[PDB]
Amino acid sequence: MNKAKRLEILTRLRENNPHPTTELNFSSPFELLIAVLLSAQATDVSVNKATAKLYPVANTPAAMLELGVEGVKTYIKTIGLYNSKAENIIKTCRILLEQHNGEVPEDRAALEALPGVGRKTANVVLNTAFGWPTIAVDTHIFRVCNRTQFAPGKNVEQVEEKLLKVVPAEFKVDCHHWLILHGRYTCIARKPRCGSCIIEDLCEYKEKVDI
């Protein structure tokens, strides 16, 4: 692949969807942090169904703490691992109240310190709630980057590091959401939708499927 081809792929993804975002519903950084903590081994539609019940009754660290571990579990019992999720939620709300004064902190090490949130999660929250140029790589973005040859790599860290070198600064805030929505709905794992792909003539995959 090369610089000019990469730039035309990013130009077509912007034309198609100028402002890509998460499929998790949220109206605040805190509501995004909790939705992302509820995401582990669950679908976005499962999480949105649970937060549609929960956030009208408690959507601040203080209201959440007042609901308690067992009150939280009542609203999220439909989601996988909800007992440990409910513990991580209450603990994170306490830390935000004490150390960060009821705010979600705009800082990677502070977010990574929170129970249940790791590097990829901190990067997704900094990008999606605060607009940071971070580009977290999951299995979808890994498959898309290697199939197209946009940013090939042998594991997650190599693709993440290549993406931070090859994506122009202009495109780095929307890059993660463009590539994950492309992987989820077009460049899917079993039988890619190549005959209907908006970047098919720029993609370098040798096994394209419906011409």
Task: Name the residues that contact ligand SF4, by CB under 6 A.
Answer: 147-148, 186-187, 192-194, 197, 199-200, 203, 205, 208
Q: How many CB atoms lie within 10 A of CB 126?
A: 21
Q: Any alpha helices (H) in the chain, and if so which ranges?
A: 3-16, 29-38, 44-54, 61-76, 82-98, 108-113, 119-130, 139-148, 156-166, 175-185
Q: How far is the CB of 6 from ligand SF4 (least distance, A)?
A: 13
Task: State in angstroms the smallest separation of the CB of 44 from ligand SF4.
Answer: 21
Query: In this complex, which beta carbon is closest to ligand SF4, that of residue 76 or of residue 187?
Result: 187
Would the annotation count 93 as a binding residue? no
Question: Annotated catalytic, 44?
Answer: no
Collect all residues with Cβ–Cβ distance below 8 Å to 22 and sequence separation of at least 6. Answer: 32, 44, 124, 128, 177
Is residue 194 part of an annotated ligand binding site? Answer: yes
Q: In the block, which residue shows the tokens 């946009």? A: 150
Q: Which is nearer to ligand SF4, 111 or 203 (CB)?
A: 203
Nearer residue to ligand SF4 within complex by CB, 85 or 140 = 140
Instruction: Record the tokens describing residue 164, joined without a space.
Output: 């931070």
Pick between residue 132 and residue 205 the one whose CB is nearest to ligand SF4: 205
Q: Which of 97, 106, 181 is nearest to 140 (CA)?
A: 181
- Nearest to ligand SF4 of 122, 187 (CB atom): 187
Catalytic residue among 73, 120, 172, 208: 120
The answer to whether the beta carbons of residues 186 and 203 sit under 8 Å apart is: no
Alpha-carbon distance 91 to 62, whole Å?
12
Q: How far is the CB of 17 from ligand SF4 (least distance, A)?
A: 15
- Which residue among 138, 162, 172, 208 is the active-site one? 138
The answer to whether 138 is a known catalytic residue is yes
Phi, psi of 125 (to 5 degrees): -65, -45
Q: Are 116 and 92 in contact (CB under 8 A)?
A: yes
d(CA 180, CA 78): 25
Catalytic residues: 120, 138
Residue numbers belonging to the annotated binding site for [4Fe-4S] cluster: 187, 194, 197, 203
